[PDB]
Design a protein around this ligand. Structure first.
Ligand SMILES: Nc1ncnc2c1ncn2[C@@H]1O[C@H](COP(=O)(O)OP(=O)(O)O)[C@@H](O)[C@H]1O
Ligand SMILES: Nc1ncnc2c1ncn2[C@@H]1O[C@H](COP(=O)(O)OP(=O)(O)O)[C@@H](O)[C@H]1O
Ligand SMILES: Nc1ncnc2c1ncn2[C@@H]1O[C@H](COP(=O)(O)OP(=O)(O)O)[C@@H](O)[C@H]1O
Ligand code: VO4
Ligand code: VO4
Ligand code: VO4
Lengths: 168, 168, 168, 168, 168, 168
């Protein structure tokens, strides 16, 4: 089925330094979404720049924004993983909540585990520290996954609750 | 008080096979709603057919949806229970979330524990598996309860927190 | 296999009145034990005196203990269920913890959810309120299950995680 | 920075009596908010009237509502505390959810832990019991804090995760 | 009843700075123990020295142990509270687990929330950071409570679950 | 310090297929232990038979046990990770609990998440399915880590709570 999608997720340095990795993974395992890849790395500036595209960010935010994003991620630990499921990209975004923790609804990853605002991040010259990245859409997922992951690092296996989600 | 309502709930076979009974019940106990009846059973087709009325499901959806529903429930295990409280029917509906798990809001039962879509269920020709059923309204709760429970299976007792919900 | 067992559990009136049914059920679902029967009822006197047999209780304890068990249970709400699994009788006992809440180890149901002591219950002349009953052994299990359930109320189905516990 | 605020919170007598203090405190600690003051007391009538202002509650509700607020809080236990964080007043309100438990959205403190309605509270003549109070705005927060806390009871320290919220 | 006891608990500066106040308080509320006093303060050196008595700590351990306890607690935030219940002193100790986190049993506060060893702290010259303090015995509890709380700060009220613990 | 240790952990295929990765990881983050490496892979035969060394398994158990272990792990998904901390090897083992789920104490990963017995696994000729592997001792950890990770996959960074565990 073409509705079966893979999405790229990153527990960002704030999530990692706060010990929130298990909490994050569980949110996705609990709804029925399937972890099919995972690795932990220090992000060098080179990879950071390959993940957050300069052209993409400055035409949708600003140059200050993109600079502080690279600052946030470069030479800092992350936990990156791929989630697979029925229309997973949209579902993952729903579970993450709004980009701005101040606005993110309770029950979501960002609404439950973070709170600070854009006004504050702007005022301080730092990036928003919002726990998780998730691919915005299908084109983003397709671009992002190979940036973090080799083909042979994406695993194929059955979760025990598969029939409840995919049907059998 | 007539504001005190009873609502019929079912943890569906997906919820049962996934080991989610306790999770579902705790959601209702935690808010202060009171369990006043419970039974576990294999649903045979006759009962499936009394609960999901042909005329209702076909008017609101289709015959195929009805067929898929009868197939999902029939000869599978459910945990059926009755919840009592102040305007409980509406509150229980809020706690469950939207019918379609893809769109069910995080924090709700269906939002936290399931995720697949109507589009995908149509593609495959199976019912949506959304963990739990709850009576939609007062007329439905009145019809549904006696189908599942005899009068003497509906219990009367006081929860220890009663004065906080019902007042004393 | 002879090792597959069924055991009788009761969430006692203290557990029910405190809104702890979901909590208790989750403990068993989470290790991989399977719920195969459930009912809620107000226990009348003869049922209480069937579950707690005068001769067993006087023998293992005393008459005063029997009387206070009957008082605690009779005319009060319980949620009764049967759990199935590999050597489930011993495993359920382990999860419950020691009879006396004061000494019950943290991590068990009794250790996490109750705390008062035999010394106090004896001083006050009431039963220990320790949240949950479970069959003490195989002979008790075989006696206790049909007191609470008809044969047709014991369910046969497959948990989605069956292969991890029973093997396939 | 001007965006750093303090806000007054009260676990109301219902929350205290229901043993929900820990739950309420964790919600705020978990998002990154900082507890900078805490005390538990029996509220006498005099203090209740300083907290819930007659003129303000009457204009926005009625005299009946105010009397029942005073009756609810007076000579009852509360756990009061102050929360500091970036735009904390708004963030704490989002976390508490709607005044009326019936409509409070799942995920919020009020949505997860209480459920009764305005209609029912009117019908019985008691205040709504919604677990928690939090200052509604900057002005209320500046009035309420000194009513509950002396200046030397507001603590100044660093949480270990400070740099994730305030930056460093 | 002579068995009703009050004990002094302190969430230590490690627990406070790691955002664990709510987690700790919940463990006590959940078993049925009652919070009857609470306050948050920065501990000055003289108070720290009334609580950790030189003669007691040197006789029980060493001068180095007393010194590192004073240094850990002094000028740092604590959340101090009093717990009331049936043999609460012994029960509270069971729930905290062994003094050394390395050996503290899973399920207890120290076991679940900390881990390092006496061996390590001795090497480094610091106190063990084991989250919480609780009175060792009845004499200690009598001595400790007035050091932290005035008599008029110890509250008298009923938990809604009181009849399940004290009986009614 | 000599007491700083790294230990190798594996969420075995049962844990992965059951959606337990988050749960396991949270146990370690929660005590203060630091995740310093992670990957997910399908284990090939040679890697399984390097992790589980024939001679060591035959001496401590038997050839049949070795065979059934290799069948369990080979061509199945795992989540492998390294945990760093003060005497982390012994601590991780405490948190895992007894090898046999039936006996593993409630509070531990194996005790809360699995339950079946050695007697049953031998009866059926399968390996015990106990959710997690962790290095038994320092020699084992030193041998095991490079089998699963390259030097450059082991991360060096500070957790926000570091000062509470390592001291600062
Ligand atoms: N379009 C659909 N496709 C597949 N299954 C459906 C569809 N609509 C409803 N269902 C299934 O039938 C049940 C009954 O439908 P309905 O009464 O509309 O929803 P709800 O149960 O939320 O009130 C749903 O809970 C769901 O399991
Ligand atoms: N119509 C009402 N009936 C009963 N109680 C009410 C009503 N409106 C408000 N209350 C109670 O009075 C408190 C103060 O009201 P208000 O300040 O308007 O809400 P909030 O506390 O959410 O800011 C509420 O928390 C609620 O407990
Ligand atoms: N008697 C047995 N029967 C089946 N499987 C076993 C047996 N003993 C051990 N195993 C499996 O092999 C793994 C390695 O065994 P061992 O090293 O003895 O335990 P541990 O994993 O606790 O170090 C175990 O974790 C378990 O999966
Ligand atoms: O890193 V994000 O594109 O999910 O804000
Ligand atoms: O109520 V019990 O027979 O488990 O002591
Ligand atoms: O810090 V106290 O150890 O004596 O529980």
């Amino acid at each position: 089925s073409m509705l079966l999608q893979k999405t790229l997720c990153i527990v960002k340095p704030d999530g990692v330094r706060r010990g929130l990795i298990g909490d994050v993974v569980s949110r996705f395992e609990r709804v029925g979404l399937k972890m099919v890849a995972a690795k932990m790395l220090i992000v060098d500036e080179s990879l950071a720049k390959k993940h957050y595209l300069y052209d993409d960010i400055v035409f949708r935010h600003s140059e200050a924004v993109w600079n502080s994003l690279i600052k946030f991620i470069s030479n800092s630990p992350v936990f990156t993983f791929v989630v697979e499921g029925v229309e997973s990209i949209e579902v993952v975004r729903k579970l993450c909540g709004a980009t701005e923790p101040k606005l993110a609804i309770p029950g979501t990853i960002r609404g439950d585990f973070s709170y600070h605002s854009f006004k504050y991040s702007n005022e301080k010259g730092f990036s928003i520290y919002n726990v998780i990245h998730a691919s915005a859409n299908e084109a983003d997922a397709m671009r992002e996954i190979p940036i973090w992951f080799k083909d042979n690092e994406i695993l194929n296996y059955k979760r025990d609750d598969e029939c409840e989600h995919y049907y059998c």
